[PDB]
Symmetry: C2
Subunit: 286 residues, 2 copies
Protein backbone atom coordinates (compact mmCIF):
# COMPACT_ATOMS: atom_id res chain seq x y z
CA UNK A 1 0.00 0.00 0.00
CA UNK A 2 1.11 3.57 -0.75
CA UNK A 3 -0.24 7.11 -0.41
CA UNK A 4 -2.63 8.47 -3.06
CA UNK A 5 -2.93 12.24 -3.55
CA UNK A 6 -6.69 13.06 -3.40
CA UNK A 7 -6.17 15.78 -6.04
CA UNK A 8 -5.70 13.09 -8.71
CA UNK A 9 -9.37 12.28 -8.72
CA UNK A 10 -10.38 15.89 -9.25
CA UNK A 11 -13.33 14.95 -7.13
CA UNK A 12 -12.91 15.24 -3.40
CA UNK A 13 -15.66 12.76 -2.74
CA UNK A 14 -13.51 9.99 -4.33
CA UNK A 15 -10.83 9.85 -1.63
CA UNK A 16 -13.63 10.26 0.92
CA UNK A 17 -15.47 7.25 -0.50
CA UNK A 18 -12.25 5.23 -0.77
CA UNK A 19 -10.58 5.96 2.56
CA UNK A 20 -13.18 7.19 5.07
CA UNK A 21 -16.34 6.00 6.83
CA UNK A 22 -19.49 8.10 6.49
CA UNK A 23 -20.87 8.89 9.94
CA UNK A 24 -24.55 9.67 10.55
CA UNK A 25 -25.04 13.09 12.24
CA UNK A 26 -27.27 11.51 14.91
CA UNK A 27 -24.12 9.82 16.26
CA UNK A 28 -22.26 13.07 16.87
CA UNK A 29 -22.73 15.50 19.75
CA UNK A 30 -20.56 18.58 20.28
CA UNK A 31 -19.84 19.49 23.92
CA UNK A 32 -17.34 22.35 23.80
CA UNK A 33 -15.17 24.50 21.55
CA UNK A 34 -11.51 23.50 21.78
CA UNK A 35 -10.16 25.67 18.98
CA UNK A 36 -10.55 27.65 15.79
CA UNK A 37 -9.05 26.22 12.62
CA UNK A 38 -8.78 27.21 8.96
CA UNK A 39 -12.22 25.84 8.06
CA UNK A 40 -14.37 26.69 11.07
CA UNK A 41 -14.81 25.82 14.74
CA UNK A 42 -13.18 22.75 16.27
CA UNK A 43 -15.16 20.96 19.00
CA UNK A 44 -14.69 18.22 21.54
CA UNK A 45 -17.66 15.88 21.47
CA UNK A 46 -18.80 12.26 21.63
CA UNK A 47 -19.17 9.73 18.84
CA UNK A 48 -21.79 7.02 19.19
CA UNK A 49 -20.45 3.85 17.60
CA UNK A 50 -20.57 2.47 22.83
CA UNK A 51 -19.42 6.09 22.69
CA UNK A 52 -15.94 7.58 22.32
CA UNK A 53 -14.62 11.12 22.79
CA UNK A 54 -13.70 12.83 19.52
CA UNK A 55 -12.37 16.05 18.04
CA UNK A 56 -14.80 17.49 15.53
CA UNK A 57 -13.77 19.81 12.70
CA UNK A 58 -16.58 21.66 10.94
CA UNK A 59 -16.83 23.40 7.57
CA UNK A 60 -18.26 26.89 8.14
CA UNK A 61 -21.13 27.74 5.78
CA UNK A 62 -20.19 30.12 2.98
CA UNK A 63 -17.05 28.14 2.14
CA UNK A 64 -15.42 28.36 -1.29
CA UNK A 65 -15.15 25.29 -3.53
CA UNK A 66 -11.40 25.21 -2.91
CA UNK A 67 -12.08 25.15 0.83
CA UNK A 68 -14.58 22.31 0.41
CA UNK A 69 -11.95 20.39 -1.60
CA UNK A 70 -9.22 21.08 0.99
CA UNK A 71 -11.57 20.19 3.87
CA UNK A 72 -12.57 16.80 2.48
CA UNK A 73 -8.98 16.38 1.25
CA UNK A 74 -7.76 16.34 4.85
CA UNK A 75 -9.99 13.34 5.55
CA UNK A 76 -9.06 11.78 2.21
CA UNK A 77 -5.42 11.88 3.33
CA UNK A 78 -5.76 10.87 7.01
CA UNK A 79 -8.08 7.97 6.22
CA UNK A 80 -5.31 6.29 4.25
CA UNK A 81 -3.21 5.88 7.40
CA UNK A 82 -3.43 3.46 10.32
CA UNK A 83 -0.66 3.76 12.89
CA UNK A 84 -0.36 4.24 16.66
CA UNK A 85 1.41 7.59 16.25
CA UNK A 86 -0.81 9.04 13.49
CA UNK A 87 -4.12 10.68 14.45
CA UNK A 88 -6.95 8.23 13.74
CA UNK A 89 -9.81 9.34 11.51
CA UNK A 90 -13.09 8.06 12.92
CA UNK A 91 -14.93 9.29 9.87
CA UNK A 92 -16.64 12.16 8.13
CA UNK A 93 -20.07 13.64 7.70
CA UNK A 94 -20.16 14.64 4.02
CA UNK A 95 -23.81 14.08 3.18
CA UNK A 96 -25.23 16.63 5.67
CA UNK A 97 -24.47 20.24 6.63
CA UNK A 98 -22.33 21.28 8.21
CA UNK A 99 -19.77 18.75 7.00
CA UNK A 100 -17.46 17.31 9.65
CA UNK A 101 -14.16 15.51 10.10
CA UNK A 102 -14.21 13.29 13.20
CA UNK A 103 -10.88 12.25 14.74
CA UNK A 104 -9.63 10.71 17.96
CA UNK A 105 -9.66 13.09 20.91
CA UNK A 106 -6.26 14.04 22.37
CA UNK A 107 -6.67 15.34 25.91
CA UNK A 108 -3.41 17.31 26.16
CA UNK A 109 -3.72 19.15 22.84
CA UNK A 110 -0.82 20.46 20.76
CA UNK A 111 2.72 19.46 21.85
CA UNK A 112 4.32 22.91 21.85
CA UNK A 113 1.55 24.34 24.01
CA UNK A 114 1.58 21.28 26.27
CA UNK A 115 5.33 21.40 26.93
CA UNK A 116 5.09 25.13 27.66
CA UNK A 117 2.25 24.50 30.15
CA UNK A 118 4.42 21.79 31.72
CA UNK A 119 7.81 23.53 31.39
CA UNK A 120 10.52 21.52 33.20
CA UNK A 121 8.32 18.75 34.62
CA UNK A 122 9.48 15.70 32.64
CA UNK A 123 12.49 13.35 32.60
CA UNK A 124 14.85 13.12 29.61
CA UNK A 125 13.54 9.60 29.01
CA UNK A 126 9.96 10.90 28.88
CA UNK A 127 10.90 13.60 26.38
CA UNK A 128 12.85 11.06 24.30
CA UNK A 129 9.81 8.79 24.36
CA UNK A 130 7.71 11.60 22.90
CA UNK A 131 10.32 12.01 20.17
CA UNK A 132 10.39 8.25 19.50
CA UNK A 133 6.62 8.24 19.08
CA UNK A 134 6.75 11.13 16.62
CA UNK A 135 9.59 9.43 14.72
CA UNK A 136 7.68 6.15 14.55
CA UNK A 137 4.74 8.01 13.04
CA UNK A 138 7.02 9.74 10.55
CA UNK A 139 8.70 6.43 9.66
CA UNK A 140 5.27 5.00 8.87
CA UNK A 141 4.45 8.01 6.66
CA UNK A 142 7.77 7.94 4.80
CA UNK A 143 7.21 4.23 4.09
CA UNK A 144 3.80 5.19 2.70
CA UNK A 145 5.63 7.68 0.47
CA UNK A 146 3.85 10.54 2.21
CA UNK A 147 5.87 13.71 2.72
CA UNK A 148 4.29 15.80 5.47
CA UNK A 149 5.85 19.24 4.65
CA UNK A 150 4.51 20.82 7.85
CA UNK A 151 6.01 18.80 10.72
CA UNK A 152 6.26 20.98 13.83
CA UNK A 153 5.37 20.57 17.51
CA UNK A 154 2.19 22.65 16.98
CA UNK A 155 1.05 19.86 14.60
CA UNK A 156 1.72 16.96 16.98
CA UNK A 157 -1.07 16.07 19.43
CA UNK A 158 -0.63 14.57 22.92
CA UNK A 159 -3.05 12.26 24.78
CA UNK A 160 -3.58 11.69 28.50
CA UNK A 161 -0.86 9.01 28.45
CA UNK A 162 1.66 11.40 26.79
CA UNK A 163 1.52 9.51 23.50
CA UNK A 164 2.40 11.86 20.65
CA UNK A 165 0.67 11.62 17.30
CA UNK A 166 1.28 13.38 14.01
CA UNK A 167 -1.70 15.51 13.03
CA UNK A 168 -2.48 18.29 10.52
CA UNK A 169 -2.76 16.57 7.17
CA UNK A 170 -3.25 19.51 4.82
CA UNK A 171 -4.00 19.05 1.15
CA UNK A 172 -3.10 22.63 0.31
CA UNK A 173 0.05 23.74 1.98
CA UNK A 174 2.50 26.35 0.65
CA UNK A 175 5.51 28.06 2.24
CA UNK A 176 4.95 31.34 4.07
CA UNK A 177 6.37 34.39 2.26
CA UNK A 178 7.01 36.92 5.07
CA UNK A 179 10.64 38.13 5.43
CA UNK A 180 10.18 38.72 9.21
CA UNK A 181 7.77 37.10 11.73
CA UNK A 182 9.89 37.90 14.83
CA UNK A 183 7.14 36.59 17.15
CA UNK A 184 4.61 34.74 14.97
CA UNK A 185 4.38 33.32 11.40
CA UNK A 186 1.33 32.90 9.04
CA UNK A 187 -1.98 30.98 8.74
CA UNK A 188 -2.38 27.77 6.79
CA UNK A 189 1.20 28.16 5.69
CA UNK A 190 4.39 26.24 6.20
CA UNK A 191 6.73 28.28 8.40
CA UNK A 192 10.23 29.00 7.09
CA UNK A 193 11.78 28.26 10.53
CA UNK A 194 10.89 24.55 10.32
CA UNK A 195 11.63 24.01 6.62
CA UNK A 196 14.79 22.52 5.06
CA UNK A 197 16.98 24.80 2.87
CA UNK A 198 16.32 22.84 -0.35
CA UNK A 199 12.55 22.97 0.22
CA UNK A 200 12.74 26.75 0.64
CA UNK A 201 15.08 27.43 -2.29
CA UNK A 202 14.21 24.69 -4.78
CA UNK A 203 10.71 23.71 -3.56
CA UNK A 204 12.17 20.23 -3.06
CA UNK A 205 10.10 18.48 -0.37
CA UNK A 206 11.07 14.88 0.40
CA UNK A 207 11.08 12.69 3.49
CA UNK A 208 14.58 14.08 4.02
CA UNK A 209 13.15 17.60 4.36
CA UNK A 210 10.65 16.16 6.90
CA UNK A 211 13.76 14.92 8.73
CA UNK A 212 15.07 18.49 8.92
CA UNK A 213 11.71 19.54 10.40
CA UNK A 214 11.88 16.63 12.83
CA UNK A 215 15.24 17.95 14.04
CA UNK A 216 13.53 21.26 14.75
CA UNK A 217 10.79 19.34 16.61
CA UNK A 218 13.51 17.66 18.73
CA UNK A 219 14.80 21.11 19.69
CA UNK A 220 11.25 22.31 20.52
CA UNK A 221 10.76 19.27 22.73
CA UNK A 222 14.08 19.45 24.56
CA UNK A 223 13.53 23.20 25.19
CA UNK A 224 9.92 22.74 26.39
CA UNK A 225 8.41 24.72 23.51
CA UNK A 226 10.91 27.47 22.87
CA UNK A 227 10.41 29.24 19.54
CA UNK A 228 13.08 28.06 17.10
CA UNK A 229 15.53 30.91 16.35
CA UNK A 230 13.86 33.07 19.01
CA UNK A 231 12.84 36.44 17.57
CA UNK A 232 15.11 36.48 14.51
CA UNK A 233 13.29 37.54 11.36
CA UNK A 234 12.79 34.84 8.72
CA UNK A 235 15.28 36.79 6.62
CA UNK A 236 17.96 36.43 9.29
CA UNK A 237 17.06 32.80 9.99
CA UNK A 238 17.66 31.77 6.37
CA UNK A 239 20.82 33.84 6.08
CA UNK A 240 22.26 32.28 9.23
CA UNK A 241 21.33 28.72 8.31
CA UNK A 242 22.92 29.00 4.87
CA UNK A 243 26.07 30.35 6.55
CA UNK A 244 26.20 27.20 8.67
CA UNK A 245 24.44 28.40 11.82
CA UNK A 246 22.51 25.72 13.67
CA UNK A 247 20.45 26.08 16.87
CA UNK A 248 22.55 25.49 20.02
CA UNK A 249 22.15 22.60 22.45
CA UNK A 250 19.13 23.08 24.73
CA UNK A 251 19.80 23.20 28.50
CA UNK A 252 20.19 19.70 30.01
CA UNK A 253 20.02 17.98 26.61
CA UNK A 254 22.17 14.82 26.37
CA UNK A 255 24.94 15.21 23.78
CA UNK A 256 23.71 12.13 21.91
CA UNK A 257 20.33 13.82 21.38
CA UNK A 258 21.81 17.12 20.24
CA UNK A 259 24.08 15.21 17.86
CA UNK A 260 21.02 13.58 16.30
CA UNK A 261 19.46 17.05 15.87
CA UNK A 262 22.64 18.11 14.07
CA UNK A 263 22.46 15.04 11.80
CA UNK A 264 18.90 16.04 10.91
CA UNK A 265 20.13 19.53 10.00
CA UNK A 266 22.79 18.46 7.50
CA UNK A 267 22.69 21.10 4.75
CA UNK A 268 22.91 18.40 2.09
CA UNK A 269 19.82 16.23 2.45
CA UNK A 270 21.40 12.94 1.35
CA UNK A 271 23.56 13.16 4.46
CA UNK A 272 20.60 13.22 6.86
CA UNK A 273 19.44 10.02 8.55
CA UNK A 274 16.16 8.43 7.44
CA UNK A 275 13.24 8.09 9.87
CA UNK A 276 14.08 4.40 10.22
CA UNK A 277 17.59 5.33 11.44
CA UNK A 278 16.11 7.86 13.85
CA UNK A 279 13.68 5.35 15.42
CA UNK A 280 16.54 2.85 15.88
CA UNK A 281 18.85 5.50 17.35
CA UNK A 282 16.18 6.66 19.80
CA UNK A 283 15.28 3.06 20.72
CA UNK A 284 18.89 2.41 21.80
CA UNK A 285 18.77 5.49 24.04
CA UNK A 286 15.54 4.26 25.67
CA UNK B 1 13.95 20.85 -27.45
CA UNK B 2 11.62 21.03 -24.46
CA UNK B 3 11.38 23.14 -21.28
CA UNK B 4 13.83 22.42 -18.46
CA UNK B 5 12.87 23.33 -14.88
CA UNK B 6 15.90 25.25 -13.49
CA UNK B 7 15.06 23.74 -10.08
CA UNK B 8 16.21 20.30 -11.26
CA UNK B 9 19.83 21.39 -10.89
CA UNK B 10 19.52 22.58 -7.33
CA UNK B 11 21.96 25.27 -8.34
CA UNK B 12 20.55 28.33 -9.96
CA UNK B 13 23.76 28.92 -11.90
CA UNK B 14 23.25 25.83 -14.01
CA UNK B 15 20.25 27.06 -16.00
CA UNK B 16 22.11 30.37 -16.41
CA UNK B 17 25.22 28.63 -17.81
CA UNK B 18 23.09 26.50 -20.10
CA UNK B 19 20.60 28.97 -21.47
CA UNK B 20 21.96 32.53 -21.15
CA UNK B 21 24.82 34.75 -22.30
CA UNK B 22 27.05 36.35 -19.70
CA UNK B 23 27.25 40.11 -20.35
CA UNK B 24 30.18 42.22 -19.13
CA UNK B 25 29.12 45.15 -16.90
CA UNK B 26 30.99 47.62 -19.12
CA UNK B 27 28.45 46.88 -21.89
CA UNK B 28 25.39 47.95 -19.88
CA UNK B 29 24.37 51.53 -19.05
CA UNK B 30 21.19 52.43 -17.14
CA UNK B 31 19.51 55.67 -18.27
CA UNK B 32 16.20 55.82 -16.39
CA UNK B 33 14.00 54.00 -13.88
CA UNK B 34 10.94 52.49 -15.57
CA UNK B 35 9.46 50.58 -12.62
CA UNK B 36 9.88 48.72 -9.36
CA UNK B 37 10.06 44.93 -9.50
CA UNK B 38 9.95 42.10 -6.99
CA UNK B 39 13.78 41.98 -6.95
CA UNK B 40 14.85 45.61 -7.27
CA UNK B 41 14.45 48.60 -9.58
CA UNK B 42 13.86 48.13 -13.31
CA UNK B 43 15.67 50.45 -15.73
CA UNK B 44 15.70 51.34 -19.37
CA UNK B 45 19.23 51.45 -20.71
CA UNK B 46 21.53 50.53 -23.57
CA UNK B 47 23.47 47.35 -24.31
CA UNK B 48 26.74 47.49 -26.23
CA UNK B 49 27.26 44.54 -28.58
CA UNK B 50 26.44 48.37 -31.94
CA UNK B 51 24.05 49.26 -29.15
CA UNK B 52 20.43 48.32 -28.54
CA UNK B 53 17.92 49.62 -25.97
CA UNK B 54 17.22 47.16 -23.16
CA UNK B 55 15.12 46.68 -20.05
CA UNK B 56 17.40 46.08 -17.07
CA UNK B 57 16.28 44.28 -13.94
CA UNK B 58 18.58 44.38 -10.89
CA UNK B 59 18.93 42.12 -7.84
CA UNK B 60 19.10 44.60 -4.96
CA UNK B 61 21.73 43.88 -2.27
CA UNK B 62 20.54 42.12 0.89
CA UNK B 63 18.61 39.46 -1.03
CA UNK B 64 17.80 36.05 0.46
CA UNK B 65 19.10 32.87 -1.16
CA UNK B 66 15.57 32.07 -2.34
CA UNK B 67 15.45 35.49 -4.02
CA UNK B 68 18.78 34.84 -5.73
CA UNK B 69 17.41 31.48 -6.92
CA UNK B 70 14.20 33.07 -8.20
CA UNK B 71 16.04 35.97 -9.86
CA UNK B 72 18.50 33.77 -11.77
CA UNK B 73 15.56 31.43 -12.42
CA UNK B 74 13.70 34.08 -14.39
CA UNK B 75 16.72 34.28 -16.72
CA UNK B 76 17.16 30.50 -16.67
CA UNK B 77 13.60 30.15 -17.97
CA UNK B 78 13.53 33.02 -20.49
CA UNK B 79 16.83 32.01 -22.09
CA UNK B 80 15.33 28.69 -23.23
CA UNK B 81 12.88 30.46 -25.50
CA UNK B 82 13.29 32.06 -28.91
CA UNK B 83 10.13 33.42 -30.51
CA UNK B 84 8.82 36.72 -31.96
CA UNK B 85 6.12 36.95 -29.28
CA UNK B 86 8.21 36.00 -26.24
CA UNK B 87 10.39 38.65 -24.59
CA UNK B 88 13.99 38.09 -25.70
CA UNK B 89 16.66 37.67 -23.06
CA UNK B 90 19.81 39.52 -24.14
CA UNK B 91 21.80 38.12 -21.26
CA UNK B 92 22.64 38.31 -17.58
CA UNK B 93 25.28 39.79 -15.36
CA UNK B 94 25.86 37.00 -12.81
CA UNK B 95 29.61 37.33 -12.28
CA UNK B 96 29.40 40.80 -10.71
CA UNK B 97 27.17 42.73 -8.30
CA UNK B 98 24.54 43.88 -8.57
CA UNK B 99 23.32 41.05 -10.77
CA UNK B 100 21.21 41.98 -13.78
CA UNK B 101 18.73 40.48 -16.19
CA UNK B 102 18.89 42.20 -19.56
CA UNK B 103 15.93 41.94 -21.96
CA UNK B 104 14.63 43.57 -25.13
CA UNK B 105 13.15 47.00 -24.48
CA UNK B 106 9.40 47.41 -24.98
CA UNK B 107 8.52 51.08 -25.56
CA UNK B 108 4.83 50.83 -24.72
CA UNK B 109 5.12 48.87 -21.47
CA UNK B 110 2.44 46.59 -20.01
CA UNK B 111 -0.58 45.86 -22.23
CA UNK B 112 -3.31 46.52 -19.66
CA UNK B 113 -2.00 49.98 -18.78
CA UNK B 114 -1.25 50.73 -22.46
CA UNK B 115 -4.84 50.06 -23.54
CA UNK B 116 -6.49 51.98 -20.68
CA UNK B 117 -8.27 55.18 -21.81
CA UNK B 118 -7.49 54.39 -25.47
CA UNK B 119 -11.07 53.29 -26.19
CA UNK B 120 -11.82 53.77 -29.88
CA UNK B 121 -8.18 54.44 -30.82
CA UNK B 122 -7.62 50.94 -32.25
CA UNK B 123 -9.63 49.04 -34.85
CA UNK B 124 -10.99 45.59 -33.99
CA UNK B 125 -8.36 44.27 -36.41
CA UNK B 126 -5.53 45.87 -34.42
CA UNK B 127 -6.87 44.50 -31.12
CA UNK B 128 -7.23 41.05 -32.67
CA UNK B 129 -3.68 41.38 -34.00
CA UNK B 130 -2.48 41.93 -30.43
CA UNK B 131 -4.39 38.84 -29.27
CA UNK B 132 -3.00 36.77 -32.16
CA UNK B 133 0.57 37.75 -31.18
CA UNK B 134 -0.01 36.71 -27.57
CA UNK B 135 -1.62 33.44 -28.72
CA UNK B 136 1.35 32.70 -30.99
CA UNK B 137 3.74 33.15 -28.09
CA UNK B 138 1.55 30.90 -25.97
CA UNK B 139 1.42 28.33 -28.79
CA UNK B 140 5.21 28.37 -28.78
CA UNK B 141 5.36 27.90 -24.99
CA UNK B 142 2.78 25.09 -24.94
CA UNK B 143 4.77 23.24 -27.61
CA UNK B 144 7.84 23.55 -25.38
CA UNK B 145 5.73 22.07 -22.57
CA UNK B 146 5.99 25.27 -20.56
CA UNK B 147 2.88 26.14 -18.56
CA UNK B 148 2.98 29.86 -17.75
CA UNK B 149 0.40 29.91 -14.89
CA UNK B 150 0.37 33.73 -14.75
CA UNK B 151 -0.90 34.84 -18.17
CA UNK B 152 -2.58 38.27 -17.85
CA UNK B 153 -2.47 41.55 -19.74
CA UNK B 154 -0.24 43.02 -17.01
CA UNK B 155 2.35 40.38 -17.99
CA UNK B 156 2.25 41.17 -21.70
CA UNK B 157 4.57 43.89 -23.05
CA UNK B 158 3.96 46.07 -26.10
CA UNK B 159 6.63 47.53 -28.42
CA UNK B 160 6.46 50.69 -30.54
CA UNK B 161 4.91 48.73 -33.44
CA UNK B 162 2.17 47.32 -31.15
CA UNK B 163 3.70 43.83 -31.14
CA UNK B 164 2.68 42.03 -27.96
CA UNK B 165 5.07 39.68 -26.21
CA UNK B 166 4.63 37.32 -23.29
CA UNK B 167 6.76 38.37 -20.33
CA UNK B 168 6.92 37.59 -16.60
CA UNK B 169 8.62 34.22 -16.41
CA UNK B 170 8.59 33.50 -12.71
CA UNK B 171 10.01 30.46 -11.00
CA UNK B 172 7.45 28.57 -8.88
CA UNK B 173 4.83 31.32 -8.45
CA UNK B 174 1.89 30.51 -6.16
CA UNK B 175 -1.83 31.29 -6.21
CA UNK B 176 -3.02 34.19 -4.08
CA UNK B 177 -4.98 33.24 -0.96
CA UNK B 178 -7.01 36.35 -0.55
CA UNK B 179 -10.79 36.06 -0.35
CA UNK B 180 -11.26 39.78 -0.95
CA UNK B 181 -9.09 41.74 -3.35
CA UNK B 182 -11.90 43.94 -4.71
CA UNK B 183 -9.55 46.56 -6.22
CA UNK B 184 -6.26 44.60 -6.58
CA UNK B 185 -4.05 41.55 -5.81
CA UNK B 186 -1.07 42.55 -3.66
CA UNK B 187 1.46 41.31 -6.22
CA UNK B 188 3.97 38.48 -6.58
CA UNK B 189 1.18 35.89 -6.63
CA UNK B 190 -1.06 34.39 -9.29
CA UNK B 191 -4.42 36.17 -9.12
CA UNK B 192 -7.58 34.10 -8.69
CA UNK B 193 -9.41 36.25 -11.29
CA UNK B 194 -7.20 34.96 -14.13
CA UNK B 195 -6.98 31.32 -13.02
CA UNK B 196 -8.96 28.30 -14.30
CA UNK B 197 -11.32 26.52 -11.85
CA UNK B 198 -9.30 23.28 -11.79
CA UNK B 199 -6.04 25.14 -11.06
CA UNK B 200 -7.68 26.88 -8.09
CA UNK B 201 -9.51 23.82 -6.71
CA UNK B 202 -7.06 21.04 -7.56
CA UNK B 203 -3.76 22.85 -8.29
CA UNK B 204 -3.96 21.40 -11.79
CA UNK B 205 -2.06 23.81 -14.06
CA UNK B 206 -1.80 22.88 -17.72
CA UNK B 207 -1.69 24.55 -21.10
CA UNK B 208 -5.50 24.33 -20.98
CA UNK B 209 -5.54 26.39 -17.79
CA UNK B 210 -3.31 28.88 -19.65
CA UNK B 211 -6.07 28.93 -22.27
CA UNK B 212 -8.60 29.96 -19.61
CA UNK B 213 -6.26 32.82 -18.66
CA UNK B 214 -5.93 33.74 -22.33
CA UNK B 215 -9.70 34.07 -22.56
CA UNK B 216 -9.49 36.53 -19.67
CA UNK B 217 -6.74 38.40 -21.55
CA UNK B 218 -9.06 38.58 -24.60
CA UNK B 219 -11.64 40.32 -22.43
CA UNK B 220 -9.06 42.74 -20.96
CA UNK B 221 -8.03 43.65 -24.50
CA UNK B 222 -11.53 44.06 -25.94
CA UNK B 223 -12.56 46.17 -22.92
CA UNK B 224 -9.42 48.34 -23.18
CA UNK B 225 -8.07 47.18 -19.83
CA UNK B 226 -11.14 46.78 -17.64
CA UNK B 227 -10.59 44.77 -14.46
CA UNK B 228 -12.01 41.25 -14.89
CA UNK B 229 -15.10 40.85 -12.62
CA UNK B 230 -14.83 44.54 -11.68
CA UNK B 231 -14.68 44.95 -7.89
CA UNK B 232 -16.19 41.62 -6.89
CA UNK B 233 -14.29 39.92 -4.07
CA UNK B 234 -12.31 36.84 -5.06
CA UNK B 235 -14.75 34.85 -2.92
CA UNK B 236 -17.67 36.06 -5.04
CA UNK B 237 -15.73 35.60 -8.29
CA UNK B 238 -15.06 31.92 -7.56
CA UNK B 239 -18.64 31.38 -6.41
CA UNK B 240 -20.06 32.92 -9.58
CA UNK B 241 -17.77 31.08 -12.00
CA UNK B 242 -18.52 27.72 -10.38
CA UNK B 243 -22.24 28.58 -10.74
CA UNK B 244 -21.70 29.13 -14.46
CA UNK B 245 -21.26 32.90 -14.60
CA UNK B 246 -19.01 34.17 -17.36
CA UNK B 247 -17.96 37.76 -18.07
CA UNK B 248 -20.35 39.54 -20.49
CA UNK B 249 -19.48 40.56 -24.05
CA UNK B 250 -17.41 43.74 -24.17
CA UNK B 251 -19.02 46.73 -25.89
CA UNK B 252 -18.41 46.65 -29.67
CA UNK B 253 -16.86 43.19 -29.51
CA UNK B 254 -17.64 41.09 -32.60
CA UNK B 255 -19.59 37.96 -31.65
CA UNK B 256 -16.98 35.58 -33.07
CA UNK B 257 -14.38 37.05 -30.70
CA UNK B 258 -16.72 36.71 -27.74
CA UNK B 259 -17.57 33.13 -28.81
CA UNK B 260 -13.87 32.33 -28.68
CA UNK B 261 -13.52 33.78 -25.17
CA UNK B 262 -16.43 31.61 -24.10
CA UNK B 263 -14.74 28.48 -25.51
CA UNK B 264 -11.59 29.39 -23.52
CA UNK B 265 -13.78 29.51 -20.40
CA UNK B 266 -15.31 26.04 -20.73
CA UNK B 267 -15.58 24.64 -17.19
CA UNK B 268 -14.10 21.32 -18.40
CA UNK B 269 -10.53 21.96 -19.56
CA UNK B 270 -10.74 19.27 -22.23
CA UNK B 271 -13.42 21.33 -24.03
CA UNK B 272 -11.18 24.40 -24.41
CA UNK B 273 -9.44 25.12 -27.73
CA UNK B 274 -5.67 24.62 -28.01
CA UNK B 275 -3.41 27.63 -28.56
CA UNK B 276 -2.61 26.36 -32.06
CA UNK B 277 -6.38 26.45 -32.75
CA UNK B 278 -6.66 29.94 -31.23
CA UNK B 279 -3.91 31.33 -33.50
CA UNK B 280 -5.61 29.96 -36.62
CA UNK B 281 -9.04 31.17 -35.57
CA UNK B 282 -7.74 34.69 -34.94
CA UNK B 283 -5.77 34.64 -38.23
CA UNK B 284 -9.03 34.03 -40.09
CA UNK B 285 -10.65 37.04 -38.36
CA UNK B 286 -7.84 39.15 -39.79
Amino acid sequence: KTYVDPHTYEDPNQAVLKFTTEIHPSCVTRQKVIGAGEFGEVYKGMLKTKEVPVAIKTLKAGYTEKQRVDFLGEAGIMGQFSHHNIIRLEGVISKYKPMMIITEYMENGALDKFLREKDGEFSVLQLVGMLRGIAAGMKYLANMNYVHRDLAARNILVNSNLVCKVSDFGLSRVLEDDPEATYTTSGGKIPIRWTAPEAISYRKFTSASDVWSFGIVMWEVMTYGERPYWELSNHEVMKAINDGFRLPTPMDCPSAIYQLMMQCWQQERARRPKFADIVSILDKLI
